[PDB]
Amino acid sequence: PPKRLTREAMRNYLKERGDQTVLILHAKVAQKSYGNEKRFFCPPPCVYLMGSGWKKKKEQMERDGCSEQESQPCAFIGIGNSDQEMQQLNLEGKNYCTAKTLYISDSDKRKHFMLSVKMFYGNSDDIGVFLSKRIKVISKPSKKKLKNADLCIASGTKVALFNRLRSQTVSTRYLHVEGGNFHASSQQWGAFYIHLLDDDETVRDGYIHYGQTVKLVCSVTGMALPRLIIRKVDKQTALLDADDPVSQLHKCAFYLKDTERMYLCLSQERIIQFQATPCPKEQNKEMINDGASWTIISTDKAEYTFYEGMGPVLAPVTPVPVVESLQLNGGGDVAMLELTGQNFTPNLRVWFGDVEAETMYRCGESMLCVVPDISAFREGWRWVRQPVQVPVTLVRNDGVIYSTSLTFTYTPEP
């Protein structure tokens, strides 16, 4: 039968933390296909397997007699209904795989959907079903123009940047940090924070408009580009006088501030600067290189982390709970902690460090638990003598551990 997590096994986990993590990276918007069209999601949704637990799991399975294909994690992806209209992803040799041929027909009437990722090992042992964040279905890019918060880009949020032509032999390329440099990758795409700057030269809020100075920061490596002025393009000109909101899937260019019309530009797989030509017709326009035209789109991320605290289990690890936030109560006579998040179940207990707490399930989004007494952690303490911080972890009845990034602090009373 399945075993409950022991205090010792929790201690061992807390010491090492070899979690298995599934990340799903995708755009927040998808353009619908009309008729027999296939307009593929771009950038292509990406599944990443993160953490040292994938290697540990793989070694455990092979020691127990699995071959390499049997221990290989497998993934299928689709857009959230029936059927095995799900497309296979190849994760062999890679950390990750992109879903390059997903689309949504106009016969689908949903205004929003989630990607569904189904995972199992090559021996057919179920891992489970992992959901993306919400994706809004759009008809096509505008323009021009804010009341539609969903179609605008807020300062501090993440964007992908890709470079297309209508038809080319060469692969669509995506801004992606790799090998210690910004590159225009055919295989992976980065998500960049887009920071609006005080254009004097720090954080400034609100939505991004053409003609504003922004900083692009890789959400993964923290690498940053120089100050850029984001400008609007149509066909092959950057419009110098546009100042309307930047919107989903619009073409734009990045003029390197204080430069003699140099723009961020791709060259094969390299990111360079290229000089625009001044345009004799009208002076409020500059002709740009095709490598200097980028499509911008807001990006999101679903992340699930799990660990077999008591060894292999027969139930899938999913639905994986995610804790958004922690709220202290008091309240009743008991010190209570409220957890808000997703995928909660009555088979979960909140653990404070290596101490299991009485936990009350309310719904998939809410749980309460009894804050252990400080002596719990500090033997003989009859009150909080100095601050004590402990990790908060969710644990399932079969010993699977769902780590949280959150802690709880006991603070001395003033």
Add this chain to the structure above:
DNA sequence: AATCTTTCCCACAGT
């Protein structure tokens, strides 16, 4: 009338 969003159509450059 006017303006905006959705759907439909076509042509490009690659198979």
Add this chain to the structure above:
DNA sequence: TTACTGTGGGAAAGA
């Protein structure tokens, strides 16, 4: 050459 395929741009339709 003709036939077929995603994609951007622009026309037509619907709101």
